[PDB]
Every structure is written in structure tokens, then in C-alpha cells.
Amino acid sequence: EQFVASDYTLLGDATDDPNGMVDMPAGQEPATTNAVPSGVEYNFLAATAGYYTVSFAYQNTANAAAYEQLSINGQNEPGVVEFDQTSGASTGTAYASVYLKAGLNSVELNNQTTDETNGLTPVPEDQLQASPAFQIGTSTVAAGASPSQETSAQSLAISNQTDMQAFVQGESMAPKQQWTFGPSLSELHVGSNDELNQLDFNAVWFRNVTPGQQAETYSPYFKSNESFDANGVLHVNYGAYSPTGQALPVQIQATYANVPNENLIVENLSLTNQNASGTQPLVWDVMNATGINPGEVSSTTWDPTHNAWIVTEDQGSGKSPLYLAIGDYQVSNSTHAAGVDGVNVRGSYSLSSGASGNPSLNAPDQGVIGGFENNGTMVGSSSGASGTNLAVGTTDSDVTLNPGQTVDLSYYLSTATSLSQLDANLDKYTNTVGSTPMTDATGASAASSWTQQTATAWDDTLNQAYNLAGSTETSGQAATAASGQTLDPTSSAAAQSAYRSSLINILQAQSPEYGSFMASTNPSYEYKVWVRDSAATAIGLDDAGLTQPADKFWRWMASVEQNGMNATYSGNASGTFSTNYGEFDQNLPIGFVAPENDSQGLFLIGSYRHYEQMLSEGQTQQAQSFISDPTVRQALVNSANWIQENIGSNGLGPADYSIWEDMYGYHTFTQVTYAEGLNAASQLASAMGEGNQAQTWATGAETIKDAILRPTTASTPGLWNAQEGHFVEMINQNGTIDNTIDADTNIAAVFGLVSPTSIYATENAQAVENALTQDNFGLSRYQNETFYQSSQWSPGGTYEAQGISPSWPQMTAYDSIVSMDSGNTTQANNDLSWIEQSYDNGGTPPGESYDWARGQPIESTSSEPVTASWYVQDLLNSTGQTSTLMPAITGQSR
Amino acid sequence: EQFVASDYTLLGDATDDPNGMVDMPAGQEPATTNAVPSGVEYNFLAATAGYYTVSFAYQNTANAAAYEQLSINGQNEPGVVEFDQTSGASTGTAYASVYLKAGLNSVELNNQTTDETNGLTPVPEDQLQASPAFQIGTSTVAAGASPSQETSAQSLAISNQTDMQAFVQGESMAPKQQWTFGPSLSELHVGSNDELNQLDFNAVWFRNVTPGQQAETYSPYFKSNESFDANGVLHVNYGAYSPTGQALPVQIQATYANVPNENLIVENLSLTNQNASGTQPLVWDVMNATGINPGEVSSTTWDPTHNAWIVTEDQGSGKSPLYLAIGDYQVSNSTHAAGVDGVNVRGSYSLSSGASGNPSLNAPDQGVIGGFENNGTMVGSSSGASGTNLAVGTTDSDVTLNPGQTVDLSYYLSTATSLSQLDANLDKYTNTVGSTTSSTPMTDATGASAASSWTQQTATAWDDTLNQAYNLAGSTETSGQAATAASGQTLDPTSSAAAQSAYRSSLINILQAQSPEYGSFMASTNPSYEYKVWVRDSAATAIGLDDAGLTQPADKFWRWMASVEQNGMNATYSGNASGTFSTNYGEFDQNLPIGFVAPENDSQGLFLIGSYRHYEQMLSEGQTQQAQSFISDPTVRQALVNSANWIQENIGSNGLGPADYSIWEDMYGYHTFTQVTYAEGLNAASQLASAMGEGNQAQTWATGAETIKDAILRPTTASTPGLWNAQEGHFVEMINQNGTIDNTIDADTNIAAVFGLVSPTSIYATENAQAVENALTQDNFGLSRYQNETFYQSSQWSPGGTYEAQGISPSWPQMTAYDSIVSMDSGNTTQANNDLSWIEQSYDNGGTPPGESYDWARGQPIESTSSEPVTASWYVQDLLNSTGQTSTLMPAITGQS
Numbered sequence A: 001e002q003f004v005a006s007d008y009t010l011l012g013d014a015t016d017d018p019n020g021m022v023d024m025p026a027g028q029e030p031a032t033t034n035a036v037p038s039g040v041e042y043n044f045l046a047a048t049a050g051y052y053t054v055s056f057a058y059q060n061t062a063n064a065a066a067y068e069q070l071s072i073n074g075q076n077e078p079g080v081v082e083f084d085q086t087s088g089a090s091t092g093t094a095y096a097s098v099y100l101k102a103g104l105n106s107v108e109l110n111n112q113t114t115d116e117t118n119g120l121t122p123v124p125e126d127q128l129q130a131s132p133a134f135q136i137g138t139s140t141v142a143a144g145a146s147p148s149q150e151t152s153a154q155s156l157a158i159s160n161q162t163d164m165q166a167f168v169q170g171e172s173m174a175p176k177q178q179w180t181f182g183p184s185l186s187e188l189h190v191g192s193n194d195e196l197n198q199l200d201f202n203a204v205w206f207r208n209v210t211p212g213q214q215a216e217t218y219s220p221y222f223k224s225n226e227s228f229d230a231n232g233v234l235h236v237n238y239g240a241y242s243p244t245g246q247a248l249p250v251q252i253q254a255t256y257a258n259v260p261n262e263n264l265i266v267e268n269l270s271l272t273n274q275n276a277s278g279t280q281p282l283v284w285d286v287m288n289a290t291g292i293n294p295g296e297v298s299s300t301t302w303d304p305t306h307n308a309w310i311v312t313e314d315q316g317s318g319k320s321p322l323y324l325a326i327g328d329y330q331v332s333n334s335t336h337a338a339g340v341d342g343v344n345v346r347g348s349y350s351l352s353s354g355a356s357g358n359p360s361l362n363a364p365d366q367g368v369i370g371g372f373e374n375n376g377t378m379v380g381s382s383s384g385a386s387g388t389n390l391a392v393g394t395t396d397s398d399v400t401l402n403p404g405q406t407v408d409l410s411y412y413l414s415t416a417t418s419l420s421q422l423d424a425n426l427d428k429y430t431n432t433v434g435s436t437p438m439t440d441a442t443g444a445s446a447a448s449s450w451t452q453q454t455a456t457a458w459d460d461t462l463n464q465a466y467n468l469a470g471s472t473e474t475s476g477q478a479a480t481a482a483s484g485q486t487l488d489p490t491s492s493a494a495a496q497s498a499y500r501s502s503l504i505n506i507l508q509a510q511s512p513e514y515g516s517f518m519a520s521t522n523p524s525y526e527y528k529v530w531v532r533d534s535a536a537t538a539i540g541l542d543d544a545g546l547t548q549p550a551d552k553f554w555r556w557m558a559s560v561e562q563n564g565m566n567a568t569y570s571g572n573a574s575g576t577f578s579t580n581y582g583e584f585d586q587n588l589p590i591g592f593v594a595p596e597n598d599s600q601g602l603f604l605i606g607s608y609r610h611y612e613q614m615l616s617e618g619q620t621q622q623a624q625s626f627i628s629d630p631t632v633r634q635a636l637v638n639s640a641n642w643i644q645e646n647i648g649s650n651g652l653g654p655a656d657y658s659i660w661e662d663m664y665g666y667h668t669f670t671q672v673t674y675a676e677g678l679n680a681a682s683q684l685a686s687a688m689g690e691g692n693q694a695q696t697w698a699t700g701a702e703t704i705k706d707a708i709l710r711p712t713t714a715s716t717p718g719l720w721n722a723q724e725g726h727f728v729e730m731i732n733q734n735g736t737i738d739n740t741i742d743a744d745t746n747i748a749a750v751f752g753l754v755s756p757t758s759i760y761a762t763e764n765a766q767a768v769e770n771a772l773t774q775d776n777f778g779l780s781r782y783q784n785e786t787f788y789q790s791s792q793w794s795p796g797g798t799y800e801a802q803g804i805s806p807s808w809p810q811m812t813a814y815d816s817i818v819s820m821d822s823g824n825t826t827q828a829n830n831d832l833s834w835i836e837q838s839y840d841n842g843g844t845p846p847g848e849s850y851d852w853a854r855g856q857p858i859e860s861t862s863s864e865p866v867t868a869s870w871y872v873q874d875l876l877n878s879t880g881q882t883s884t885l886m887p888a889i890t891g892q893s894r
Numbered sequence B: 001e002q003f004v005a006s007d008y009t010l011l012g013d014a015t016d017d018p019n020g021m022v023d024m025p026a027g028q029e030p031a032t033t034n035a036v037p038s039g040v041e042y043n044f045l046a047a048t049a050g051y052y053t054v055s056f057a058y059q060n061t062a063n064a065a066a067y068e069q070l071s072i073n074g075q076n077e078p079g080v081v082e083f084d085q086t087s088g089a090s091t092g093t094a095y096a097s098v099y100l101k102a103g104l105n106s107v108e109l110n111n112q113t114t115d116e117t118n119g120l121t122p123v124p125e126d127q128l129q130a131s132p133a134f135q136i137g138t139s140t141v142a143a144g145a146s147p148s149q150e151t152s153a154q155s156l157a158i159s160n161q162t163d164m165q166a167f168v169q170g171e172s173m174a175p176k177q178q179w180t181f182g183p184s185l186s187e188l189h190v191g192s193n194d195e196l197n198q199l200d201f202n203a204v205w206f207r208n209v210t211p212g213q214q215a216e217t218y219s220p221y222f223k224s225n226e227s228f229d230a231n232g233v234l235h236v237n238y239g240a241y242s243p244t245g246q247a248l249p250v251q252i253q254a255t256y257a258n259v260p261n262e263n264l265i266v267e268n269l270s271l272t273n274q275n276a277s278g279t280q281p282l283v284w285d286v287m288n289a290t291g292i293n294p295g296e297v298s299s300t301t302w303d304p305t306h307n308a309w310i311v312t313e314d315q316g317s318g319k320s321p322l323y324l325a326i327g328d329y330q331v332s333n334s335t336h337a338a339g340v341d342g343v344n345v346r347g348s349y350s351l352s353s354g355a356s357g358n359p360s361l362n363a364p365d366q367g368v369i370g371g372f373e374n375n376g377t378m379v380g381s382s383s384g385a386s387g388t389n390l391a392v393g394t395t396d397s398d399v400t401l402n403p404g405q406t407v408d409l410s411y412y413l414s415t416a417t418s419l420s421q422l423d424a425n426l427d428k429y430t431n432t433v434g435s436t437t438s439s440t441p442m443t444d445a446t447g448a449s450a451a452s453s454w455t456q457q458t459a460t461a462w463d464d465t466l467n468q469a470y471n472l473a474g475s476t477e478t479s480g481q482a483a484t485a486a487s488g489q490t491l492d493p494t495s496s497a498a499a500q501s502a503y504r505s506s507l508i509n510i511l512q513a514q515s516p517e518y519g520s521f522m523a524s525t526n527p528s529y530e531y532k533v534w535v536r537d538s539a540a541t542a543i544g545l546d547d548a549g550l551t552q553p554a555d556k557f558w559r560w561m562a563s564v565e566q567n568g569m570n571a572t573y574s575g576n577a578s579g580t581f582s583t584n585y586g587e588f589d590q591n592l593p594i595g596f597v598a599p600e601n602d603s604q605g606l607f608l609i610g611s612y613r614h615y616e617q618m619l620s621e622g623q624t625q626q627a628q629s630f631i632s633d634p635t636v637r638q639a640l641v642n643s644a645n646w647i648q649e650n651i652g653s654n655g656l657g658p659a660d661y662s663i664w665e666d667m668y669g670y671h672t673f674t675q676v677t678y679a680e681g682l683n684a685a686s687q688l689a690s691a692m693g694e695g696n697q698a699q700t701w702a703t704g705a706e707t708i709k710d711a712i713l714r715p716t717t718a719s720t721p722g723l724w725n726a727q728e729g730h731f732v733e734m735i736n737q738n739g740t741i742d743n744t745i746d747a748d749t750n751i752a753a754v755f756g757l758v759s760p761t762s763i764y765a766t767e768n769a770q771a772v773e774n775a776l777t778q779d780n781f782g783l784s785r786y787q788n789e790t791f792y793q794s795s796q797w798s799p800g801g802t803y804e805a806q807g808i809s810p811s812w813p814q815m816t817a818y819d820s821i822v823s824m825d826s827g828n829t830t831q832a833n834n835d836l837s838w839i840e841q842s843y844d845n846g847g848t849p850p851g852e853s854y855d856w857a858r859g860q861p862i863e864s865t866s867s868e869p870v871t872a873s874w875y876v877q878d879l880l881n882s883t884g885q886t887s888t889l890m891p892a893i894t895g896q897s
């Protein structure tokens, strides 16, 4: 439904504008005598309760963001709606996802931004007070949740599925990041030497040289968002120039295309003059500049044929050098320079200083970048250069930007282990896909063709995945009901976007060499592999029918299992895993919290489900290949024997730190993975040539199950509080009960260790919903828990989440799964809508957490593949395309 | 269910105490690195969703209140739980009413007091940071809502039902009150000269003179609560001495008994040493001191027979003086002094200064009070004194207070128009009830018994009055009228203890706020609203009394309202023509119109509706002579007919009556609320037509009622707009002066369904009810008047000062009551009962009906207009409607008969 300006009730100093829009006044409503909110209100009739997206068309030509409080039914929504500076004469759209009641809902936008959680404002108070006067037009209310507008992922990886990962990062990746620089392509990891970051940065500078205007270089100090399209191409949308607070009158968009089964990254910059029709055309110079890893002694010569710098970069002791081409698809207006930066790009401007002034005006006229920042002329050699701190650049000059007419400028990166291979690459990548000196025409077409090939290649990969039942997806595998299930199609556009975004994001975060997943695409978690996260990630890919990349992961996990050579206790014996591994090595264990004994079970569960999934898709050769692989078979058997042998006299396996990694004891979560691990082992027994062990493992699975379900008040305590109707966190080392309600205890019902309709499942689910809910359907891990809030361990800095016990989409996912399975589809669908609005700008799966105080996903660990997986498991479970359930544990082998 | 200390999960620096209780740490959780909440948590299984009372046994031996954030299911409840200083070795109980979900609920108390609404903390930040270390014991979760613990009424009236009203007031009656002094009996209005406040104050000073301790006078600068018991006796419970922040080791309680059909006010002070058994007994001196109205030239002589100061107080030009006796029921150890205060009792200590020090230590050794404050010896004459600024006092000395042994000290007030009548009064009131006239000297024995007997007679007399009211169906009330269903209805009994307390408290509070001379109700018992009579409030109040079967005090009101109707002799427009009422009248005059917001045209209709319901109620109770007397009284009959003719004649071209300011008094236009009163007014007139000797007018008025009803229900999009938004499914606030629609959703539009102008099951009723619930709900079942409304918050008009309510659009129990009535009538009893529970926790400390508003940000009723009889009435209408003992519905408007 559409609400035009004339449908609004005006409040306070909100006035009608002669131009038909509404004038919103500057500033925050003070707590003074007769103070009233200024803004707009209207009423919307909701046919059914649930999530709707509320949008406002607006203009903001000031050099600061405006903030308004969204209020539904007189209740201030978490956080404030941000109205960012709009380019030239363009109209922006601000939007929020809100839970509406059935029937009439009041929708109000006002300057009452004065509420606090935990003594904090959702954005700094000084920015709420500096909120400038701006204009709003039409409001829209549409059915369905939308991703967070205000919070974007600020670090994402692009993979070629073979040997090359690049990271594209905004100017700030976490609140606590003191340095500012971006957006940029800042990391490059290639198979030949995967640990090494080949680059310092590859980034784009813009210079206005419009006749009659003050010439000025805009360096990479922009607010930005970034997200994948449906076809695996990464989009970066530029906002305000942070140092001046200006929306430049040109809209800047960049796409990065890492071409699968090639060695090419295409960068496409779209420049659109957003000034009114008939205004003086703008003229811009654009520099694409690359700093090589400063420590690596490197040399470069110009290649005039391919219009590229050819770099030889040393790789350290005893390793062959890497050869890189950094090219410019524009020829006629292109100049080139090699030498030094001439500036510290990460020491020129800090976001903390606000609109402190364009740092380009302070740059000395030295180096490739200093020169361009200073007067638009790169300083250095047009032939070549050599040393540490090597920099190269290409400038495209006198680019005419007419009102409303998009101009594309493209650049490229290729790597090879030999100059001869790089030259062959360059002949390929400076021409169209099918297809000597490159022209403006052949360059433009090459960039287009290879960008399109990226899209085609990712489409062919994602066509191995199931179509979402009821969606407009047709090119994938036929939507099929899983065992036990009935198809339950969804027409939800939000579900289709999130499903697609989730799959592409999981695959782009997978090591192309090794098959291990980055737990987070943000360096806050050091790109480390958590074996739990990756296992749970692969379970999701299998559910989605993506058995190939899943298979690559399961075989990797088998290969890195600890064989017990250096065993000192059960936690690192045969059949166990390191909590962490490196993302850029075949097998580099990294010391972290230990023991975590959930990985054994999840390995068995996921491998079992992977085997069965391949059989379900008729991939019988691939299934037989997997289960008969000596490494997989031995790894699975060792893990099974570990759980079986380490069952104690109380029927529980060893104490651990488990999923939250924060307390030692007999955790319900890990105990469930033990029981279901042995269940999985029993199921696989015959196929692993271990038929005689099937009954032992089935008995083991029942023994641990019976221990979990045993009352806490029994003579030998179990993990079930019968008095309160919920699982406990854990039994402590000394036999006392940690009675804390933990949303992760829904894992019992998720795997079907208890039936989802059992008293155990329904009572536990109700306890968790009752005690751990924030923002309607956000579930906390447990109460009085400060990770992302006060905790020093908070990866993005303290109070990134302001509300204690932040909401975790993974926990909301468990609730949705258990709710769906027990016939409560209302709760299941509300949960899915909630997870969809926990996603970041442009539909990127978020990190671990969501600040229920601010209505914002956490930036610092966006994006987290395991979160994407749990959404996919949740959604496909709700359409009956998967069942998260394992076979019932009975103590009988099949 | 009970949760002992050992059932708690301890958080942060909360520790087990060797003594079996839990040590809660000092201070507020800061916003610093690794900061964690300190406190306790446990889980409670609720069989059914709804309101429960959560209690904590505790001790606080510091000289500051402790505050904790109550958190249910990880959601901070509105405001903070206050843990006040505990006397000696006593154990206190802190409690909150909370909505629980079906199944498991987490109950947590912690120091995370850092949340803000509208940039404000629910108590001053410095007090949250100063929250001292204290100990908690057992927690209790009990089914049902309880009144607000933290907020008390701070001004209540006691009536003798004939000719005397006294006001008993705490040290502060509103946040904006800059002066501090109380508790006291501060106002006294007698029938002979009702406008005049006879007193400055009558108050009690306490002096510790315990051997071996530093002697010190505690003046009336105490935190206190006050509420009526079931029998119309007013209780004042003393808290901390504000100037030192100390809970004195003696628990002080005062009862005030204004004896009906007499001229006596008894003050009973209960002193209970709360120190441990076997500790040194304490010794106290107690002064009861009275300042006369300072402006009135007065004289006093001592009466040693009755042990009282006899005051002659001038009344102004052309009026005979009033005679007062201020007496001491203690004769042994009594001294007496007359003269001047010697101090400004309202300029000695301010609450704003915090624990600034005992102001008694700064008092000069001058005057009755200065002297007692200074060294325990009143300064003045033991014979008499004369002038302006007259003060008198009696001190009772060497009162021994043993651990746990309550000692009663009693004082008295009597007034008369002649010294001869005062002497007769004094013989009566210094002896036990039904004593033969004795003018012999009062002794310690006769005094103690007199105080007791006259206090008991107050209880008996109010019991006889309230026994004319219906027993609440399903309650333990038996001494009242038999619980009866209203015609066509079935009894729906309630075993709710909360309902019984609130019902009883509501009735006694309404009657204690009625003018004994005139029958008009004070809109508020708090001077913020100048004790003015709002004719709407009083009409709606009387409707509630009639529902409760209290037809006598209702009848006294309806006859008064008839008598003060404007006859139109000086009419300048429709708003003050024949059949209209002044928005305000004086509470201390027969007929003193007071200029306020005008016109308000809702009073005409409410007069007709309430008079109709009053007539029918008397018939229902077999009071046929009283019914016939009422409807045939020339004043009542003419007043009703004039109001009916006013509504009929003033129906405009759109079928709506004249524009007005209506119930909220804040906007001019064609308000749905007032239009409903027009339509139902004519309905009432039609019903009464034959009994008023106006049978020929019955059909005209019935047609009028239908005409206005049809206009209300006419769509806003019709060529001539009505008040029904068909697109959005709700009534609009009003049509504006210029014919535009004010589309604002207003909870008062539920009045249509309350009176049955639309059936409660109609699409109109259910859609409007849903719109109001959806848009105007705070704190689960609190309903705002309308959105973006700053009365009690930012508004300069806020009677208790700005931001008394921190949350914009405060919750109004009257609006929650309408929702409960409409919900019950449409079969949604869950919503109806949740609403009743919500109103019950909107009541003030000790079960006093609140004022108009409740701050949904702080979980506290507003102090500044506590208590408001109309709020009490709407709860009574709501409750009796839910038990089927009344129906708020009028006969269906059809246009027939």
C-alpha cells in the first residue's frame, strides 16, 4: 500500500512543502516544557500479523545523515531509521522491517530519538542532535521482511572455485577499527602460496576536473555497502565521502567478478551524474592504483599490448615468484605510473574525526597516489620500477558524465606461476569469451563478456541446488519432498532472495583449494576455520542439494582429523578435531578453546546425511566413492570409537566447552552430538564395512540419550529439569546442575533425539521462547551474557551490541525448525521473517548476532556461513525439502 | 509459590550471607568493559498467563533507598523496584505486579537500572548510583495484581457525611511542590463557612529522649503512604525521616477517624519499637501542634477538664466566629503551650536538598514548635494567647516503647458555632460511646477508651453506609445487599481478593470525596485540581454508586446537579442556555460556577443517562417511594426536561449536536464522545418521558436519539461526513470546526459500545475496540487517550509538574475500563480480566483509587491527581459489569417509543 504526503497527519514542526513533499525539521525532540514530536503518522490495515517493510522516499542534500524514530502502535522500534545524504537531485528510500498486529497499526516517524538501552543511544547522541532538516515523500507498507538497510557486511571473499580468493572491504570493518580506508580489494590469496596476501590494496580514486569547479581528488574514504547478486558478482554501492560528509553528485557503484575456472578478477565502476537534466556535464579523472604487499621485493614493466602493469613479486625463502597483471580496459584516455604510494592510505584519514576535511588537500605531490591526490597526475615511471613498497596505477582522464547517463570504467587482475602463462591469460582476458593490440571497444567488450561469464559459471554451480518450492527458481534441481515430509511451497520473495543469497555466500566463503569455510568473512575472526561451523555449514549445502561443494568439505574434514599420535587426553585423541584450523593451509591446526567435543558427532551426522543426500539425488557413484574412501571411512570409524569408548558410568561423554566455548562441563548441546554421532555411525556401519559394530553404536546412542533425558533430581542426575520443563545448560564437573536455560538445547528436537511433538521438545521450546525472546522472535543464547556487549572478547569492540544477551539468528532458526515440526507454522514463519531482517544490506547473511536494542545485525562477524546454513536448513525444513531430524534413537540397529 | 534464598541463581557480586539471606551489592551496573548485572534470578511456572504479584522479603539498614531493575523473561519491567530503609531489626517486603506468560517465566532482580524513556531515568540517576548494599530473603509469586507499592495518594479527604471535611496530606503532593511538610491534617472545611480552611496544619512531632542517647526532635518531614481501610478510617504509614534518610527504630502509624453524624476527628498514633527483643526500651516525647489559619485573628484558653485548647477563630466580615477544641486524650505527662509556631514549617526543610540534616537542630528556642524542635519544651503560655499566626500544642512525655509492644497516643478535634455546643461536644467525645453526659475531668482511662470507642464508631457508621451497597458476587462480603444479576444477565462470581479490596476501597474513597453539605464530588482529592467539581466526573461517579446499589449518596448528587443546572436567564450561546451546566463548580458552595474550558456539552447527556439509571436502580431495589420522589421533584424533573429539550433542539443539519471540548477539554469540534452522550441522553429522556409527565415528547426524543446515532455511524466519506472511518474500522476523534475529519484514534470512542449505542458484538464495536487496543496500548493493557499527547508529560498544563509521566501519551485506567466493559460484553473475558488486573495495579499504595493517569515508562500511577473518584467509579462499573451485577448498556436506540 502507498501513502502519499497528503495522507500523513503532520506532528510538531513538520510542514507541507510547496513542492508536494513534507519538510522534516532539524534535530532531536528535547526533554523541555511543551516539547512535542515533529514528523508524520498514518494508519495501515494488516490482513494478517507478521513482518512488513515500511519505506519512505526522501531527499537529504545536507552533509550529515538524518535519523528518525520509527514508532508502531506508539511503541518505538529498536534503533532509528537512517536517512543518508542523497546524490545531486536523486530521491533516496529509507526502510525498516517491523512486526505488525492483525488489523489497524499506527505508523509514525518522529524526532523522539531520546530512548536508551543500557545507558546508550543507538547512534552517537551528537549525530542524533546534528540530524539536519530534510524532505520525505511517499511511504510504502509491503508484506514481508527486508534485510537491514543500515548494516552491511564490510568484508566479503570472491572465489574462482580453483586457486584464488580476493577480499573486498569497506573503509571500516568494525567499530573498534581505528584506521579508515575503503572500499578496496585489500587481500589476495592464490593456491601457489595461499597464506600470503599478495596485495597491500587495489582501490579507485576519483578526481572532479569539471571546468569552472574546484578540482578535487576523492580518495577511498567512502561509506559503502556490499552484497552478492544472484549470480555471484559482488556489488559495492558508494555512499557519502566520510571526510566531507558529502553525497558526491555522481552515484558510484563497483562490481567485482572473480571468474570461476579462470584467473581473472574484473572490476566494473558505474558512474551516474545524479544532477538534474540539462545541468552542465561533469568531467572526472579515475585512477585504479595497486600497492603490492610492501614487504615483498617486486619489479614491474608496462605491457602496452594488454594495457597492464606486469608485476614479479617475491614469495619468500625457497618459493618461485608470482606474476600479476593489473590492467585498464580503457586505452585511449589511459596513462600509467609505477613507483611508491607517496602516502600511507591507512594513516591519511580516521572516521573518528568525522567530516575533518578532504585528506587529498594534504597529500604531497609524490608517488602514484600522493600525485593523483595532490593534482590528478600520478608521479613515477611510465616504463617500470623495482623494490619493496611497490605501487602501480592507471588514470583514465576527461570522462564526461552527463545527467542520468551511466558510464562504465573497467579494470582487471590476473596471476600466473610463469610470465608465459600470464601472457596467454592476458590474450584470453583482453578479448570476448568465445573469440592483437587492445582498443577501447575490445576492452569494454572483454570486461562485459568476462563479467557475464562469472554470472553464467555461478548460475551453472547453483543449478546443482534445489529450486525453492513455490519460488520462481526453475533452472535448479526439481523441488522434491524429503523422507517423512510433504512439500509446503512458499511464494515469499524474501525467502527466495535469502535462500539464493545464503547459497552464493556460503560457496564464496569456501577455500577453493581445500574446501574449508571461513567462520566469518570479516578479519575479526582471522579467517580461521571452526570445524563445528564448517560441518554445520556443509549440512546446509547438502540440504540445498549442493552435494559437490559439501563433499569437498567432508573429505577435507576427514583429512585433518587428529589420529592421536601426540594425544595427552581424550580431547586430542584419535577421532577428535582441533577447534580451529587455518583457511589458507591443507592442515594447520590453530590453538583455541579446547576441548570442544561437538565436532566428532557433527562430522558423523553430516557425513551420514551427505551419504543419504547423494543417494536421494541418484548420485550413487559419488555416494559409494565417499563412503568407501579410506580417509573418510577411517576418520568416521575413529570418531565413532572415540564417542563409544568415552561414555562414562553416568551414560554421558566427556565434559567440554561446547558451541559457546565459554564454560567447561557436561553440556546438553555436545551430549546430543555424542548420541546422534553414534546414531549416524550405526546407520553407516554396514556401508563402512563395520556391520558388527552397528549394534554397539546403536546401544551407545540410546545410553547417552537416556542420560540426557534422565531427571536432574535422579540419584544419578541427567540433563532434564522435570520440575521446570527444560534441558539444563550442563552438569558441572562436581556433579551440581547449571540450570541456565540455553536456546542451544533445542538441538535435541532439531536432530529428533526427542520427537518434536514429545513433552521434552514442546516444554523446552516454550521455556526458551518465554525466557530468551527479544525483538519479538530474536532468541538470545542465554541471559546475562555479554559477548558483543560489555565482554572484552567482543570481536568488533565492546558495546557493538548495546543490549545484554544479543539475539542469535542460529537460535531463532532452531525455534523455527522445532515449531514447524510440532505444527506451529505461525511461529516458524515469523521466525523466518525475523531471520530475513537479521540479514545485512543487499541480502548478505549476517554474522553471529543481532543487537535487539538497535534493530541491527552485528557488522564485526558479518558474514558467517554457519548462520546462512542454519537459515537454509530452517527454510528448506519449512518447505519439506529437508528434515533436520536424524533417525529416531531406539538402541536397535536398522 | 515461595522461593527461599537457596533457590536463587546468584549473578555478579550477589553473595550468600552466613545468616541465610542474599547480600545484594551497592550501586548501578556501569556501561564499562566486562560489566555484568549483580542480583538474583529464579524461574516460575505459570499455569495461566496474567498478572501475578512478585514479592521480596528484605532488610535495608542504610540511610538511602535501594533500587533494583525487575526483569521478566529478559525484559526490564517499567521503572525500578524500591527497597526502602527498614526500621530497627524489622524485615520489609518489596513487591511489583507483572504480566507473566503461560509456562516458565524468568524472574530477575539486578542493578542494570540504566534504561531510559524520553531521555529520563525512572528515579534520579544520583539515587540509582547511591543504591546501597542490602539483603534479600524469600521471594513469593502469587496470582493476581496488587496496588502500586512505590506511589501513594498524598492527599485524601475524611467526611462526617454532614458538615465537616478534613484533608490529610504527605510531605509532598506533587513532584513540582517546592516546599516539604507532612504528614499533616492541613485543611478543615465546616458547613458554617465551607470555603474557609480553618487550619494552617495539625501535625505530630516526635522527640527521642532515651537515657544514654542524643535527644533529638523528628519534625513532620517523613516519607509516608496513606489509604482507607474497609471501614472509612484513614491510615498514614510513616517511612524514612527525609532530612536524615533514617528509618527511625520506631514504626509510626497514624489513623484519622472523622466520626459520621458527629463533630469529632480522632487521631491515633501507634508507636512500635522495631529493635530486637531484650534491647534497651526507648523513651519518646510526642507533641500534637496546631497552627490556625494565619490570616484569621484568633484567641485560645486552656480547658483543663477536657485537656484541650479552646480556639475562637474569626471567620471574616459579617460572620460569627468558629469554636475549635484541639485535645490530648493523654492526661498524665501532658503539658500545653499557646503562642506562635516560632518556625516556618514549610520553609525549614526541602526534599530537593536530600538528606541535608535534621532541621530541628537549626530551630531557634522560640514558639510552640521551635521550642519542641530545639530542646523538647514548647515555648508560650500554658493559659492562653491571641492574634494572627496563632499556634497551640500538647506534649506527652516519657512514653516508654518496648521492643514489639505497640503504644497508642490519641488526640482530637471538635468544632461548633457556639461555646455551649462545643462544651456539650467535649463531654460526649472525652467519654466512651453511649456515655451519660459528664462534665467531670477526663482521666488516662476515659481518654484511651474515648479515642478507641469513637474510632470504632467511625468504622461502624461507614459499615452501615456501605452495607446499602451490593456484596461483590463470589467475594467474602456478606453484610451488604444480596448479590443480584441485572435484568437478562447471569451472575459471574469472582473469588479475586484483589477485586474485593479494590471494590471496597473504590466505594469508601468515592463517598469520602463527596461534599457532606452539597453531594458534589471533588474531581481529585489532591489540591492540583483545586478540589473543584467537574460535573462530568461527578455524574460518571454517581453512575458507579447507583451500579453498586448506593442509591442514597447517588440521589444526593443527582438532586444537587439538577439544582445547579443553568436555566438560560443570562444565555449568550447554546453552551450556557437552558439545560446546560458549567464545566466546573466549587466543592465548598451550594452553586458556585467556576469558569474553565467551555463549552463542554457532555454533562447534559450524562445527567439524563445517570438520572435514568438512578430511577431504574431504585425501582430494581424496591425503593418505589424514593424513585417516585426523585422523578416528580420539580427541580429534578424540570432540569431533566430542559437538558432533553437542549439536545433535541440543538441537533444540527448533519444530525450531530453542537461542537464542544468534550472529556479531554483540549480541542474544539464534533467529538464522538460528546455526540454519544447527546444520543444516549435523548434515549434516557424518551425512557423517563411518561414518568416526568412528558409522555407526548417520548417519540420526538426517541427519533432524536436515532438521528444522532445514525450521524455517528455515517461514514466519514459520505457526502455529509459522519464519525465512522469505514476504511480503517474506527470512530474518528471528531469532525473539525471547518468540516474536515480529525482521524485521530481516541480510546474514549469505546463509550459508544459501553452505552450500547452500537451493540458490543456489532462490527462497529469490535473493529473500534481492536483499533484502540492495537494503537493505544502500553504496559500490556494500559490504554492512552490518543497518541502524541503530552498531558502529565511535557505539557506546561501538567498538574504535578512537567515529566511527572515520562512516557508521552500516559495510560488512563478509565480507558482500560471501557476496553474491559466492551471486551466482556463481546465474550472476550480474557482481555476483560487482564484489564481489571491492570487497573488494580494502577491503584495507589494501600488500595486507594488513583488519579487520571499511569506512567507506562515507570510502571507507576500519577501522584498529582490521586485520588480521582471518577476513576474509582469506572473500575466499579467495569467490575460489576464483569460479575453481571450491572450492565453499562442503555436500552438499544431504535427510534421507537
Ligand SMILES: C[C@H]1O[C@H](O[C@H]2[C@H](O)[C@@H](O)[C@@H](O[C@H]3[C@H](O)[C@@H](O)[C@@H](O)O[C@@H]3CO)O[C@@H]2CO)[C@H](O)[C@@H](O)[C@@H]1N[C@H]1C=C(CO)[C@@H](O)[C@H](O)[C@H]1O
Pocket (backbone or CB within 6 Å): A519, A520, A525, A530, A532, A533, A592, A593, A594, A659, A660, A661, A662, A787, A793, A848, A864
Ligand atoms: C569466538 C568466541 O569468542 C568468545 O570466546 C572467548 C572465550 O570465551 C574466552 O574464555 C577466551 O578463551 C581463551 C582462554 O580463556 C585462554 O585460556 C586460552 O585457552 O585461549 C582462549 C582463546 O582466546 O577468549 C575467547 C575469545 O578469543 C566467546 O565466549 C565465544 O562464544 C565465541 N564463540 C562463537 C564463535 C564461533 C566462530 O564463528 C562459533 O564457532 C561458536 O559456536 C560461537 O560460540
Ligand SMILES: C[C@H]1O[C@H](O[C@H]2[C@H](O)[C@@H](O)[C@@H](O[C@H]3[C@H](O)[C@@H](O)[C@@H](O)O[C@@H]3CO)O[C@@H]2CO)[C@H](O)[C@@H](O)[C@@H]1N[C@H]1C=C(CO)[C@@H](O)[C@H](O)[C@H]1O
Pocket (backbone or CB within 6 Å): B523, B524, B529, B534, B536, B537, B596, B597, B598, B663, B664, B665, B666, B791, B797, B868
Ligand atoms: C484538567 C485538564 O487540564 C488540561 O486542560 C488544559 C487545556 O488543554 C488548555 O486549553 C487550557 O485551557 C484554558 C483555555 O486555553 C483558555 O482559553 C480558557 O478557556 O481557560 C482555560 C483554563 O486554563 O488549560 C487547561 C488546564 O488549565 C488537559 O488538557 C485536560 O485534558 C484536563 N482534563 C482532565 C481533567 C478532569 C478533571 O477530573 C476531567 O474532568 C477530564 O475528563 C480530563 O480530561
